[PDB]
Amino acid sequence: QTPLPVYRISMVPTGQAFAALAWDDWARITRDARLAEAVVSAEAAAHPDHGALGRRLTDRIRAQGPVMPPGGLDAGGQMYVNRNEIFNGALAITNIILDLDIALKEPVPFRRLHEALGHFRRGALAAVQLLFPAARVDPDAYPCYFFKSACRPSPVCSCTDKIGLRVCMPVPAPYVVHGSLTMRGVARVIQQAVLLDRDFVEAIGSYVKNFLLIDTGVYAHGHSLRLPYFAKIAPDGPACGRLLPVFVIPPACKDVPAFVAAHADPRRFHFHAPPTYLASPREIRVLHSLGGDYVSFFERKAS
Amino acid sequence: TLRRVLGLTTACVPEEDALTARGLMEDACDRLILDAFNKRLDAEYWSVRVSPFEASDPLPPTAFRGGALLDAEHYWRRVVRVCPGGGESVGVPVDLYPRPLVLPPVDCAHHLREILREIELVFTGVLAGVWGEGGKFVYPFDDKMSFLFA
Amino acid sequence: LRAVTTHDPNPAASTEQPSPLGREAVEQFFCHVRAQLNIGEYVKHNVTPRETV
Ligand SMILES: [Zn+2]
């Protein structure tokens, strides 16, 4: 049944394969990155504070998934080591997916990073509320999912200069987004809203080199983005940098176990995954334009 | 739409009446385009008839393999338009292939523009005649509705 | 420089006028730079949403 997801696999030692899949084994893909509901409940009972709870859960999950089995393998056996989703211009976007690429001059801790993520979540939600005015977005309960590329040669961080992150958040109902330009505009607005947050800048501004975080060129027909739970292929050696969840719990979360378990749902990190409604949409508003080519006010005035 | 507009004119109002008529016409066009989406996958509904005395798309080489289906073409040729790529917009002789057909998405934007031209002709004529308006009637399709098919 | 020019040496009967240098610059340019900072203002000035129901 179609539409289907088409992925681009990076074969070793060179070459690119393609895979159009009607269904897949996601339980096997996300297996060694899951926390038993009993463990989550016990930790929630232990630590009431949500920052501490999220850091504890992140530490627990980090020390669970050892490795995805690497080696040789043909395209059918490598689609479980590397996999990128290709943006299709004939479909609608139901998730806002941001590929953050921070650049540092001094290594950042992980508690500082968690605080910075908690601050980032606050401004992005305000930007989203401004962009989608007909939807009720609660800034202290809306779910946002954070993934951080693993560390290769409170969990410690051994990164060198760059901290790769992925942020996923559903488009508020009853809104849908159509177009590659529209998504670029949404990314622009999100980045501007985040960069204006005083708390986020104060918390993370010391270590960073530049304040250009969200790459807005990843939204183009045919371009591919790496999926969570998949590692980059290094021709030099083995796979590295798996994207694994970094739990940043909302302050007003009412179901912590559900939030934790929603990080392994493949529908939460795909561009055109079907929306998760409750009964049925009585009406949906498609945002099919957000202006156009942007340039800038400083550019128009100067010209 | 014309029935509604000419029935509104009976109540009588100044140029405000012309503005109301323009609004009604735009609403009618919007509803027509919205209802044309549910028939986006039907190829015989969007197929248009062509006479032997007009310019038509060249016959695809695969149309000559129909066999007994080419024995029923004597005057009219029904051609639909499909988009197999970026902007190809090729033409398909619907009646020269066995059924069911397996085609790419239909080019409903081009067909809808062709129909909207005729619709706007009538609406502009009505506006110019009943209320003396030099302003032509134009419907924004590429700005407000072209996303449903792209 | 035309605003700060004088044609009478007497300070009381001088022909100097206020300079519209800072005022014009602020009104035409520096207002929008600050207007950018507010996120709501930024969205209001650098986005034109188009949505269909
Ligand atoms: Zn790290």
**Chain B residues with CB-CB distance to C52 below 8 A:** 144-145, 147
**Resolution in A, one decimal?**
3.1
Helix (H, G, I), strand (E, B) or coil at B104: coil
* Maximum Cα–Cα distance across chain B: 63
Structure letter (DSSP) for residue B78: E
Buried b (16+ CB within 10 A) or exposed e, B28-54: bbeeebeebeeeeeebeebbeebeeee
Helix (H, G, I), strand (E, B) or coil at B23: helix
Pairing of strands A95-103, A243-245: unpaired
Q: Do B147 and A90 touch (CB under 8 A)?
A: no
Q: Which method was it determined by?
A: cryo-EM
Chain centre distance of CA B34 = 13
Pairing of strands A285-289, A175-177: parallel
Helix (H, G, I), strand (E, B) or coil at C10: coil
**Amino acid present at A277:** Y
Query: What sign does the dihedral B1-B7-B10-B11 (CA atoms) show?
Result: negative
Of C29, C42, C53, the CB nearest to A192: C42
Give chain A's end-to-end CA distance (angstroms, integer): 51
Determine how many CB atoms are found less than 10 A away from the CB of residue A196.
17
Interface of B with A (CB under 8 A): 147, 150
Partner B, chain C 1-53, Cβ-Cβ below 8 Å? 50, 52
Q: Burial, A215: exposed, middle or buried (Cβ in 10 Å; 0-12, 13-18, 19+)? A: middle
At A213, list the tokens: 């975080």
**Angle, vertex CA B39, rays to CA B42 and CA A178, nearest 5:** 115
Chain centre distance of CA A91 = 19
**A79/chain B closest Cα distance in angstroms:** 27
At C48, list the tokens: 């034109």
Helix (H, G, I), strand (E, B) or coil at B92: strand
Q: Do C50 and B145 touch (CB under 8 A)?
A: no
**Angle, vertex CA B64, rays to CA B60 and CA B67, nearest 5:** 145
Instruction: Tell me how far apart the alpha carbons of residues A103 and B80 are, in angstroms, rounded to a whole number.
Output: 54
| The residue to which tokens 């059918």 are assigned | A76
User: Within 13 Å, how many C-alpha atoms sit on residue A196's CB side?
Assistant: 21
Q: Do C43 and A131 touch (CB under 8 A)?
A: yes
Contacts with B125 (C-beta within 8 Å, 6 or more apart), sequence order: none
**Amino acid present at A182:** T
Buried b (16+ CB within 10 A) or exposed e, A134-144: eeebebeebbb
User: Residue A61: left (phi > 0), alpha (psi -120 to 50), or beta?
Assistant: alpha
Instruction: Tell me how far apart the alpha carbons of residues C49 and A283 are, in angstroms, rounded to a whole number.
Output: 18
Q: What is the DSSP string of A6-56?
A: EEEEE-SSS-EEEEE-S---HHHHSGGG---HHHHHHHHHH--SHHHHHHH
Q: Which of C48, C51, C52, C53 to mutate to test the interface with B (most CBs of B within 10 A)?
A: C52
